[PDB]
Amino acid sequence: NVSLQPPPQQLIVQNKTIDLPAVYQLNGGEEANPHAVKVLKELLSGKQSSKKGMLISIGEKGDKSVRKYSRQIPDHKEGYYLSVNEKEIVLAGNDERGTYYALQTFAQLLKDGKLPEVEIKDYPSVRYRGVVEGFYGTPWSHQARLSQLKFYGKNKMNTYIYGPKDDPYHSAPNWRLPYPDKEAAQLQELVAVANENEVDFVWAIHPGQDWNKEDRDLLLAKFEKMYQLGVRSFAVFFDDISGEGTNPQKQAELLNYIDEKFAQVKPDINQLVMCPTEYNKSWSNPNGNYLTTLGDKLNPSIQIMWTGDRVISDITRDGISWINERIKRPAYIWWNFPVSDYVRDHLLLGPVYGNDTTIAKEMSGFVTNPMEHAESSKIAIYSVASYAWNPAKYDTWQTWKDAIRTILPSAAEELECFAMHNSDLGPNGHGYRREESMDIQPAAERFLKAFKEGKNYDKADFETLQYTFERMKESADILLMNTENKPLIVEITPWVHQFKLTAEMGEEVLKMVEGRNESYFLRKYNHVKALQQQMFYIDQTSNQNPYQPGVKTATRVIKPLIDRTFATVVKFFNQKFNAHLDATTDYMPH
């Protein structure tokens, strides 16, 4: 059955299916977007017959090939019309990017050499959609970035804001310097791949550290050299700046200057974006001037980034009106999820939710700040893509499952299990939390409650927990050895080990609850203690960083259930046999 991510604006399925044609005639192969034609030719290995076979027509509005279907093509940037029936196939973009988007949709329809009969009219609700490379921690590799960009094109994200922290040429002081040949050629390769995948490579300059005519000049000259390298989209960051540099009139002046002498002078600049000094409502001064002045003086064609009501927050109608009213334009949203650079011992693999689905007209852009774990971030990235394309049809849970099935088809259920219990951030200085382990929350609560007050627990809840731990160990072991996405596995390995140990500990603790005799109980107790020690070992030796070192997993519901069940059963044991076992859950070498 027809599943499409992102879901099209309009879709009609006929409940018939046609074969991908053995023999086809291609119309418009020459005048249509070469990137789209390339995908189409990839999917086709029947024979191009010049006078026979099923017509396939590909083109942008105004091409000869799609003249007949012009009224069906949506009048929206990046829009397209796609049609499949017995007679013919139509892939008609409103523009070149739209034709490519058609083809991305077409590739998802094609299953086992068969196509549904369908008619689609489609376009994005939000103008700019993608990823800002905006996390602290170990930068992504070159290969990681190439793989991201291909994923962005598949999910119709048109925006990549480049900024690896190990590249000094977009930061102080080296922003003034041209890229040396080797680095330039690498960035060049990113640009080429971004272009092939219809993604805007947005080169971000971060000069905030370092206001005269000559600084203005050097920036403009640098922008020019990045143009020669093939860059067509640009961002200027002021999150960074202090003192005089925080003056919004002077920020506007430089940006309006860049617009006039560079962006308006070139034939083909797409995005010009700035990040303001006050970038969320919490960190702005209600008693000050900065956002209204920016909104007044900054040219209308320049985007202003915004994180919402707080630095980590989900965007609401009230939030978006607050900012738009000040900047006098639709805010370009920077969403600080799934970035984990302030909770580095946690993976954030849960669904994308919380953003208001009715406000697409009030946002110019929506970009996600991801984790230092590139592959792992694809779960949220795919979901963001889906949300930003079609927010009205956004389905958090189905999109989450679809992302997981896309990223790891050979072990989707196992990754779902792992991801379900690795979602929450735990307590943190931003107060931002996510749900986790919702499937077993009721079983866990009722189990604890009963076990607490020396009332009997339900056998079914015991079994649910038992089943959960068994499933976690199966999932951990299958994921560790999975070779379909080795980079993914490499990223999560430390947590997978910790997650397996958590499950083993849970099983041992359940055996203490059933405790048949004193000797068996003591065996399980000693095993639990040794497993706690291994978890500390991993916590002390993996993922070491100055900020949140180590590895935490299943922290919201599962680990606390195990900890409390352990402390309770040990206290019961101590009372019964008049013993003095340590009931604590965090072992300690001192």
Ligand X SMILES: CC1CCN(c2ccnc(NCCc3ccccc3)n2)CC1
| Window 430-469: residues binding ligand X (CB under 6 A) | none
Strand order in the sheet with 47-48: 10-19, 114-122, 80-84, 88-93, 54-60, 23-27, 47-48
CA 203 to chain centre: 19
Q: How far is the CB of 240 from ligand X (least distance, A)?
A: 8
Q: Does 310 bind ligand X (CB under 6 A)?
A: no
Size of interface with ligand X, in residues (CB under 6 A): 14
Q: Select 334 or 525, whichever has its Cβ closest to ligand X.
A: 334
Q: Does 128 bind ligand X (CB under 6 A)?
A: no
**Which of residues 334, 389, 394, 418 is near ligand X by CB under 6 A?**
334
Q: Does 347 bind ligand X (CB under 6 A)?
A: no
Q: Select 135 or 566, whichever has its Cβ closest to ligand X.
A: 135
39-49 CB burial, b ≥16 within 10 A, e <16: bbeeeeeeeee
Q: Does 339 bind ligand X (CB under 6 A)?
A: yes
Q: Select 9 or 355, whichever has its Cβ closest to ligand X.
A: 355
Return the range that interacts with ligand X (CB under 6 A); candidates 65-73, 259-267, 334-342, 481-489: 334-342
Is there a binding annotation on residue 369?
Answer: yes
Scanning the structure block, which residue is given the tokens 């056998």?
459
Residue 113 gets the label, from left (phi > 0), alpha (psi -120 to 50) or beta, of left
Q: Does 134 bind ligand X (CB under 6 A)?
A: yes
Three-state secondary structure call for residue 421: coil
Q: Does 65 bind ligand X (CB under 6 A)?
A: no
Q: Select 109 or 333, whichever has its Cβ closest to ligand X.
A: 333
Is there a binding annotation on residue 239?
Answer: yes
Rounded to 5 degrees, φ, ψ at 358 are: -115, 10
Identity of the amino acid at 241: I
**Which of residues 336, 376, 502, 585 is near ligand X by CB under 6 A?**
336
Q: Select 199 or 275, whichever has its Cβ closest to ligand X.
A: 275
Q: Select 99 or 376, whichever has its Cβ closest to ligand X.
A: 376
395: annotated active-site residue: no
Q: Does 271 bind ligand X (CB under 6 A)?
A: no
**Which of residues 179, 337, 342, 499 is near ligand X by CB under 6 A?**
342
Q: Select 56 or 371, whichever has its Cβ closest to ligand X.
A: 371
159-162 and 200-205 strand pairing: parallel
Question: Which residue blocks in 278-389 are alpha helix, DSSP H?
Answer: 290-297, 317-327, 378-389
Q: Which helix (H) or strand (E) holds 396?
A: helix 396-407
Q: How far is the CB of 280 from ligand X (least distance, A)?
A: 8
Q: Does 341 bind ligand X (CB under 6 A)?
A: yes
Return the range that interacts with ligand X (CB under 6 A); candidates 37-45, 47-55, 337-345, 465-473: 337-345
Q: Does 314 bind ligand X (CB under 6 A)?
A: no
Scanning the structure block, which residue is given the tokens 């099209």?
8
23-27 and 54-60 strand pairing: parallel
Is there a binding annotation on residue 19?
Answer: no
363-368 and 331-335 strand pairing: parallel
CB 449 within 8 A of CB 561: no
Q: Give dist(CA 478, CA 482) in Å, integer.
A: 6
Catalytic residue among 240, 356, 395, 563: 240
Is there a binding annotation on residue 578?
Answer: no
Three-state secondary structure call for residue 112: coil
Q: How far is the CB of 508 from ligand X (least distance, A)?
A: 37
**Which of residues 120, 241, 275, 379 is near ligand X by CB under 6 A?**
275
**Which of residues 311, 448, 581, 583 is near ligand X by CB under 6 A?**
311
Rounded to 5 degrees, φ, ψ at 324 are: -55, -35
Three-state secondary structure call for residue 142: helix
Is there a binding annotation on residue 122?
Answer: no
Is there a binding annotation on residue 341?
Answer: yes
382-417 CB burial, b ≥16 within 10 A, e <16: bbbbbbbbbbebbbbeebbbbbbebbbeebbebbbb
Based on its alpha-carbon atoms, the radius of gyration of the chain, rounded to whole angstroms, reads: 27
Q: How far is the CB of 347 from ligand X (least distance, A)?
A: 15
Q: Is the peptide bond before 300 cis (omega within 30 degrees of 0)?
A: no
Q: Give dist(CA 4, CA 104) in Å, integer.
A: 10
Q: Give dist(CA 262, CA 250) in Å, integer.
A: 18
Residues near 538 by beta carbon (within 8 Å), at least 6 away in sequence = 494, 497, 498, 501, 550, 551
Q: How far is the CB of 339 from ligand X (least distance, A)?
A: 5
Return the range that interacts with ligand X (CB under 6 A); candidates 114-122, 263-271, 305-313, 557-565: 305-313
Q: Does 135 bind ligand X (CB under 6 A)?
A: yes
What CA dihedral angle connects 159, 144, 552 and 510, to 10 degrees? 110
Q: Does 307 bind ligand X (CB under 6 A)?
A: yes
Q: Select 65 or 307, whichever has its Cβ closest to ligand X.
A: 307
Is there a binding annotation on residue 336?
Answer: yes
| Window 181-240: residues binding ligand X (CB under 6 A) | 239
Binding residues for a protein: 134, 165, 239, 279, 334-336, 341, 369
Binding residues are: 134, 165, 239, 279, 334-336, 341, 369
Summarize as ranges the residues that interact with ligand X (CB under 6 A). Answer: 134-136, 239, 275, 279, 305, 307, 311, 334, 336, 339, 341-342
Which active-site residues does the annotation give?
A: 240
